[PDB]
Amino acid sequence: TNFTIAGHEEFIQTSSPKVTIDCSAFVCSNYAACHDLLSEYGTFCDNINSILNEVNDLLDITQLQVANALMQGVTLSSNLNTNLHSDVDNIDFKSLLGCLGSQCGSSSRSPLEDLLFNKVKLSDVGFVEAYNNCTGGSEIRDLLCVQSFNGIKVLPPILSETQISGYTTAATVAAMFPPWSAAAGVPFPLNVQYRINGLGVTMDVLNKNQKLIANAFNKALLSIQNGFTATPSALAKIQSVVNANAQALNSLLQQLFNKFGAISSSLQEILSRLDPPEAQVQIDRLINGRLTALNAYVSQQLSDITLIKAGASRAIEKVNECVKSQSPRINFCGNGNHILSLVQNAPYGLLFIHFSYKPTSFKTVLVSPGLCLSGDRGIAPKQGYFIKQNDSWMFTGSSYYYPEPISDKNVVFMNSCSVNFTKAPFIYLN
């Protein structure tokens, strides 16, 4: 009988930090005698750097595919000026828009995206600022100093955060002003009513409660923005990516302190207490041990990008089948009743905002799946039921109770009187 509009979040990982490791400086950083024994494994170290290159190339291709899907066939006006109006149909979309155009600075993220990057330190800009504060200054206690000097460094991606944040903004303003390149016409106030009607709600109620729908979207976005001052499932998955990458780099760094059966772990101590003839047996145990740890990291990193690339394919589909064009698929974008979906930038992935149709009240009525008329004819409802009000047959929707007269625009005709249809030789339509 009554209905409201709900909303929920969703995070899909589409990126991963790019790590570049060189086996030359990892095992034979500066010692000359180390290179004489590593030359026999020359092909072994060449393959390690070769696999790490093709892994980072896959993250570069997937990053361009996401940016291409966000602005695939989008048309905006040259006089848009998304800094004065910022509203449509009395709906506040200011928290989802940053700055569009070259008339701004280096930061153009929306207010909602600022709540996600202020809680993640090791972001795209975090690694750049961290590595800068090692070759100069004081209080060098960060762990990234040692990893960078030993041959473990993280490279920035091709597209920056500002560029990707500017692509999600263009996709949001697309379905707000003409020519509405994100909905093929059907403006935003009308696009919502068309999809709610598809669930089984008559349009006589939607045109009378336009203020209730407008205030529902404003309340839903306000609860999502205020929900970040807590521990939700969205922030838990984002922080799990930057924490799993730190543990993998610190575990590989501790491999330089192991002995693997040798007398010590430092190559300077071995080359200072043993003669050259009996020193190759101790260095060979360190080379054969450190190279094994590299293969364990390369094989694990390759098995991890496959799950990220597979998950990135689902994010591209939701941009094309849930954001830029609503698909007739059911139980794909959200959970049953689905209306719209919006995309925002997130650290190492994207954030989705799904809106749903949630009823509040209910009532019990008697319905019929179809009645046979006089003349061996029959009728069947179309997304609805047949009710009996005041000794007369009416029509109501499957998602909203509103009796309407039976017509030919919402009833499927049939030329056969079934045995399990209620008889009613009083209703005339033709």
Partner 1 sequence: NLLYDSNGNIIGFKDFLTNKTYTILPCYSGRVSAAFYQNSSSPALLYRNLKCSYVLNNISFISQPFYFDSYLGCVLNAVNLTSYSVSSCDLRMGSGFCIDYALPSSPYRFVTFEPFNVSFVNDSVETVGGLFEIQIP
Ligand X SMILES: *[C@@H]1O[C@H](CO)[C@@H](O)[C@H](O)[C@H]1NC(C)=O
Residues forming the site for ligand X (CB under 6 A): 1-2, 88-89, 189, 419-420
Radius of gyration of the chain (CA): 31
Element (H or E) spanning 411, and its range? strand 411-414
In the block, tokens 């509203």 appear at: 87
Q: Which amino acid is at 345?
A: N
| Binds 109: which of a copy of itself, ligand X, partner 1, none (CB < 5-8 Å by kind) | none
Q: What does the chain come to in residues?
A: 430
Question: Smallest gap, in angstroms, from Cβ of residue 308 to a copy of itself?
Answer: 5
Of ligand X, a copy of itself, partner 1, none, which one sits near residue 394, judging by CB under 5 to 8 A according to partner kind? Answer: none
Cα(389)–Cα(373) distance, integer angstroms: 18
Q: Beta strand 3-12 with 91-92: parallel, antiparallel or unpaired? A: unpaired
> To 10 degrees, the CA torsion angle through 181, 187, 189, 192?
-60
Show Cβ contacts of residue 111 under 8 Å, excluding neighbours closer than 6 positions.
94, 95, 225
> How many Cα atoms sit within 13 Å of 154 on the Cβ side?
25
What whole-number distance in Å separates Cα of residue 109 and Cα of residue 345?
A: 8
Q: Is 309 near a copy of itself (CB under 8 A)?
A: yes
CB 135 → partner 1: shortest distance, Å?
6
Residue 286 CB, nearest distance to a copy of itself (Å)? 12
Residue 364's binding partner among ligand X, partner 1, a copy of itself, none (Cβ under 5 to 8 angstroms by kind) is partner 1
* Sites for a copy of itself among residues 16-45 (CB under 8 A): 16, 19, 21, 26, 37, 40-45
Which of 47, 90, 121, 149 is the binder for partner 1 (CB under 8 A)?
149
Contact pattern from residue 168 through residue 207 relative to partner 1, giving x for each residue in contact according to CB under 8 A and a dash for the rest: --x------xxx-----x-x--------------------
Name the minimum Å distance from CB 341 to ligand X.
20
Distance of alpha carbon 411 from alpha carbon 377, whole angstroms: 13
**Of 255-294, which residues contact partner 1 (CB under 8 A)?**
257
Determine, following the binding rule CB under 8 A, whether residue 247 of this chain makes contact with partner 1. no
CB-nearer residue toward partner 1: 101 or 405: 101
What is the smallest separation between the CB atom of 3 and a copy of itself, expressed in angstroms? 10
* CA neighbours closer than 13 Å in the CB half-sphere of residue 372: 12
Show the site string, 257-296: x = touches a copy of itself by CB under 8 A, - = not.
xxxxx---------------------------x--xxxxx
Q: What is the secondary structure of 376-430 as a DSSP string?
A: S-EEEESSEEEEE-SSSEEEEESSS---B---SSSEEEES---TTSEE-TT----
Q: Which of 176, 318, 354, 395 binds a copy of itself (CB under 8 A)?
A: 318
Contact 360, 6 (CB under 8 A): no
Is position 359 an interface residue for a copy of itself (rule: CB under 8 A)? no
Residue 221 CB neighbours (<10 A): 21
Rank residues 310 and 419 by Cβ distance to partner 1 and give the closer one: 419
